[PDB]
């Protein structure tokens, strides 16, 4: 691809407006956006996760008007923000009390906030914590996982093609591929780590590369892609389940000729 | 359609007023305060008392009266929390850090938001608890479904009333407010220590991409903020929501518009 | 054919001592091996999801592993109650026998021998070449956020699954040898899952179990059976 002028005119734009639901694992129907309550492994050798206890990218093909009868979509600026943020201030709901006669302890903990926008599926490159992990059937994860895949086996590429099926701690994006994708992540580890999330409707990313090109949409599809584990839900038990949220897109696209 | 802004001594106006929170008020005693918070046994349990609910506050202004075709445009703000300086009464019926220690001091999860618009604040519904029971006398997700947890587009509202609208319950709606900008911040934690910088000196821009502010239809400015700045813990152990007022300065110009 | 799931046909122990029930298959563990404990006469129970994972409810002593070619359930201090038959099951999402159980393990012991609801209907006497509509009434569920399942247990033989429907009613998958006489069919408003068993051959006759999965936000399979309904006997 060639890329040459950009279309202008009334019908030379155009908007695309959506949301992500999290897929945390909703172990029943009354915990839909929190992960079951986490089981620690008694070893390496012997870790073999339940589905519902691993939380997995969300990703959304969006079809856009078709151009053909040579145009393609042109991702320019994104909006972004999570969904519901004032959710995590609910400290009197089946919580672990912080002390005598407390409140509720709130969400908190490790936290991966994650966004992507692309002309096509996001790529991942596959790292294990521990290589003897067993994901369950039902996840796409490293097949024919090596010692060498705890710090990085190149034999462990994927495309992002699929919801309630890659887990996020198997897979990150492939920074060796993904010149048609725009992403964005933040892992904030820790234990008793505050979670800091900012809402406004006055802030812009330009998705334009330093050639001033954005993501070309291929088969006029946008892949928005998506990760908001907010942190752990402590319930009176002391079970620690992880809580996600819903993310807003809203992708400006314009009209590129190219050769 | 938008066109020229009115300039001449007449063609500028100002808004100066303080939005008191609603942090529930369980005896005038505690004005300001949020009822002790109870956790509850289980999520299906759960049915907090009104005066234990932190909820939005909300100002209609009126403007001078205008009217081819004029309308009052929200172009600069100015905000800051009135008081931050109480929190500092680390004196007055709190629980001891240790033995012969000061009092415990406000901190925890903590919600800070303002918005300006020329329309009520558009609200989306997101729920920690789909089955948490919101009380009588708050404006609450009606017809709350599994789904309500992560995202239900039938949970759509006005930021129209006082004392109503619980701030866990609603956040503003993304797919709308084009003519409202907001700003928030949730820092959650147990344990969270308050930050709260105050100076006349930081003006915010409310104008769009395209110079354009917020439009005051009906010659009607609205204000709208939250300002939980953490938990009060008393000697008891028990805390509650400590909130503060937040002053607002709007600077509004005249501007044509057509239809 | 199908993927074949091999256990030994009885195991014994005395009380205390720990029993080893194998599940033998071609490379068995990479893939998902759920572990069901059936007493006669009531609904069969999940002990081990997802190679080693146990349900609120089973104890400690109830234990699961799996790694080469032999998964291994293992109940270490044995009582009267722990005599039952043991199945493992595995998932094979795209292929024409999506969900394989195991032949079954009778467990003896040698010294001295409510949220969610699954209610059926519909079994009984009928005769060879004619019809018969099985129901299970759902309740405590938002039923189309479900998979659901038809499972049936011959005289003498083992857990043979028959049929699965999606939450929403897309996905339909049966048996080979049901094909084209069984029909699977749901009313998530009335919260029901309907078996139209039509043109009945003798080798049909079974007790007809009512298998619920996990929760799933698109009501899609996942492969494992966490809940089962008492049973209904079909006779020809």
């Known amino acids: 691809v060639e890329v040459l002028e950009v279309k202008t005119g009334v019908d030379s734009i155009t908007e695309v407006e959506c949301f992500l639901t999290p897929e945390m694992g909703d172990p029943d129907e009354h915990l839909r956006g929190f992960s079951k309550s986490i089981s620690i492994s008694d070893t390496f050798e012997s870790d073999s996760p339940n589905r519902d206890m691993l939380p997995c990218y969300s990703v959304a093909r969006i079809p856009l008007p078709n151009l053909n009868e040579i145009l393609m979509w042109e991702a320019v600026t994104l909006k972004t923000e999570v969904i519901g943020v004032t959710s995590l201030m609910n400290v009197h709901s089946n919580g672990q009390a912080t002390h005598d006669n407390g409140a509720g302890k709130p969400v908190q903990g490790t936290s991966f906030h994650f966004f992507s926008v692309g002309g096509e599926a996001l790529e991942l490159q596959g790292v294990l914590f521990n290589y003897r992990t067993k994901y369950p059937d039902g996840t796409i994860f490293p097949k024919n996982a090596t010692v060498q895949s705890q710090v990085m086996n190149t034999e462990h590429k994927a495309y992002l093609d699929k919801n309630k099926a890659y887990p996020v701690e198997c897979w990150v994006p492939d920074p060796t591929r993904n010149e048609n994708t725009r992403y964005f992540g933040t892992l904030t580890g820790g234990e008793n780590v505050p979670p800091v999330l900012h809402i406004t409707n006055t802030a812009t990313t330009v998705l334009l590369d330093e050639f001033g090109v954005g993501p070309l949409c291929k088969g006029d599809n946008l892949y928005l892609s998506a990760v908001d584990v907010c942190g752990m839900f402590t319930n009176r038990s002391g079970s620690q389940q992880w809580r996600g949220l819903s993310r807003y897109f809203k992708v400006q696209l314009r009209k590129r000729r190219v050769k | 359609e938008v066109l020229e802004v009115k300039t001449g001594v007449d063609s500028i106006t100002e808004v100066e007023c303080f939005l008191t929170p609603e942090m529930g008020d369980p005896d005038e005693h505690l004005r300001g305060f949020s009822k002790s918070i109870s956790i509850s046994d289980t999520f299906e349990s759960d049915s907090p008392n009104r005066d234990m609910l932190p909820c939005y506050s909300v100002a209609r202004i009126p403007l001078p009266n205008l009217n081819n075709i004029l309308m009052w445009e929200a172009v600069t703000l100015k905000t800051e929390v009135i008081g931050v300086t109480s929190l500092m009464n680390v004196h007055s019926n709190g629980q001891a850090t240790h033995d012969n220690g000061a009092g415990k001091p406000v901190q925890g999860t903590s919600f800070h938001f303002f918005s300006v618009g020329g329309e009520a604040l558009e609200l989306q519904g997101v729920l920690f608890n789909y089955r948490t029971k919101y009380p009588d006398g708050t404006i609450f997700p009606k017809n709350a479904t599994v789904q309500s947890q992560v995202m239900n587009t039938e949970h759509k509202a006005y930021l129209d009333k006082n004392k109503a609208y619980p701030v866990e319950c609603w956040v503003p709606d993304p797919t709308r407010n084009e003519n409202t900008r907001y700003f928030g911040t949730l820092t959650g934690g147990e344990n969270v220590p308050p930050v709260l910088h105050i100076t006349n000196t930081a003006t915010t821009v409310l104008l769009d991409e395209f110079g354009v502010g917020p439009l005051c239809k009906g010659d009607n400015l609205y204000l709208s903020a939250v300002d939980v700045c953490g938990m009060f813990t008393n000697r008891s152990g028990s805390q509650q929501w400590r909130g503060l007022s937040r002053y607002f300065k709007v600077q509004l110009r005249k501007r044509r518009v057509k239809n | 054919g199908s993927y074949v799931l091999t256990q030994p046909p009885s195991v014994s122990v005395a009380p205390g001592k720990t029993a080893r029930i194998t599940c033998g298959g071609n490379?068995?563990?990479?893939?998902?091996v759920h572990w069901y404990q059936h007493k006669p006469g009531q609904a069969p129970v999940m002990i081990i999801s997802y190679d080693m994972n146990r349900p609120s409810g089973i104890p400690e002593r109830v234990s699961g592993s799996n790694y080469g070619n032999t998964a291994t359930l293992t109940i270490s201090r044995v009582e009267a109650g722990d005599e039952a038959d043991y199945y493992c099951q595995v998932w094979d999402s795209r292929s024409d026998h999506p969900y394989v159980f195991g032949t079954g393990t009778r467990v003896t012991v040698l010294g001295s021998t409510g949220e969610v609801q699954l209610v059926e209907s519909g079994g009984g006497l009928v005769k060879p070449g004619g019809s018969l509509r099985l129901s299970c009434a759902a309740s405590?569920?938002?039923?189309?956020?479900?998979?659901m399942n038809w499972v049936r247990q011959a005289p003498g033989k083992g857990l043979e699954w028959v049929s699965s429907?999606?939450?929403?009613?897309?996905?339909?998958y049966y048996t080979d040898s049901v094909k084209g006489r069984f029909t699977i069919s749901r009313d998530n408003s009335k919260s029901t899952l309907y078996l139209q068993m039509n043109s009945l051959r003798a080798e049909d006759t079974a007790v007809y179990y009512c298998?619920?999965?996990?929760?799933?936000?698109?009501?899609?399979?996942?492969?494992?059976?966490?809940?089962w309904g008492q049973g209904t006997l079909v006779t020809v």
């Open positions: 298998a619920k999965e996990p929760f799933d936000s698109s009501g899609d399979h996942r492969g494992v059976f966490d809940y």
């Open positions: 405590g569920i938002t039923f189309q956020y479900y998979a």
């Open positions: 490379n068995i563990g990479s893939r998902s």
């Open positions: 429907i999606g939450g929403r009613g897309d996905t339909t």
